[model samples]
Target: HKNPHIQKVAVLQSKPNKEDALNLIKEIAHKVSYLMKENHFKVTNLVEFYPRDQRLLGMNVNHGSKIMLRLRCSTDEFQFLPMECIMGTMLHQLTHNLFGPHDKKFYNKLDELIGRQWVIEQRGLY
Candidate 1:
């Protein structure tokens, strides 16, 4: 079981340059932080995209008291994707962050935020 206090997010951008991708990640962090805060959650450790990696786009992990979101500038697809999609992805993963191990409650909360349509579209489940 994970702690009920903090969340970590890493933004990975996969465009051309690392700096540009890092900028975009920061932008996403700002937006996401507001959303999380709105829900009465605090985001801890907004890591920077230093020493760019060419592997992942972005990843969010939660282990009890700590959570991490990793962003890779090399495989980032969010920069070109629609903001809604990006936001949706963030929320989807956030469900993982908050409710470890997919359960009824997690899906229910996601449905509440983006509606069943989006949840289905994103996860391809009915």
Candidate 2:
């Protein structure tokens, strides 16, 4: 199964175990697709991973025709956080493709994506 909006995902080979990172990227993309369907939103593109400080967990970028989801990797903060929390961040960043800022719609969509539990857990860490 595939969505036209989300063409393909590319996980950066920043870590030693490339397979693990690839698996994580696939998981992120799958969750993002599910969230979009649940909220009746259409979005997509590629996903990448890179090493960055804990201050930034994820980001969405526009590359001509496609959107890129850049996620942080190889950091103690991200390594320590629960998988669900990381996934919550992924969902939050993906929403930026449809909503620029943390406005009402953005927050509402995020709540629908990850729920209050993971949201609170994410906020508590930061």
Candidate 3:
């Protein structure tokens, strides 16, 4: 959990209050990285939020070898994006590592992970 996949300067393009914005963001991104690693997904670089107020939740880049998790739009007033959505995007991105399309293989593994995530949630282990 300590060795986060996210480097604030590497992922974030622009933000506010310096450390304050990154503190929470890094915490959540690390959570995503932590869980995904348990499933054996090799996280190279989580390149989230290119800023500029994008609409996409996240994207898989570098031929699915890297994950970019969009936790929030830029200039956020610290009104928390849902943990559910964050994890959702994280899983989807990781699934792309194997299946590039949203076809059966992708959705199947994605759904399975999600279900397991739900189980974990039910046990309040997260």
Tens digit per residue, CA lDDT, model 1, 28-91 = 5555543454455554544434235544333454522333334432344433545554556556
Candidate 2 wrong stretches, greater than 4 Å: 1-5, 38-44, 63-81, 116-126
Give a tens-digit lDDT track for model 3, residues 1-126: 553444332335464444654565565565555455566666556554644646777777764456666655444634446767777777777778778888899899888878876775566453
Q: How close is candidate 3 to the true structure, as a TM-score?
A: 0.69
Candidate 1 error regions (>4 Å): 1-16, 46-58, 63-82, 115-126
Residues 75-106 of candidate 2 have per-residue lDDT tens digits of 44244335566676667766676678788998
RMSD in angstroms between candidate 2 and the native structure over all alpha carbons: 6.8
Ranked candidates (lDDT, high to low):
3, 2, 1
Pairs in clash, predicted candidate 1: 3-64, 9-69, 10-69, 10-70, 11-71, 12-71, 12-72, 13-73, 14-76
lDDT of 1: 0.49
Worst 10 residues of 2 by lDDT: 63-72
Model 1 clash number? 9
As a whole number from 0 to 100, the lDDT of residue 4 in candidate 3 is: 45
RMSD of each: 8.7, 6.8, 3.6
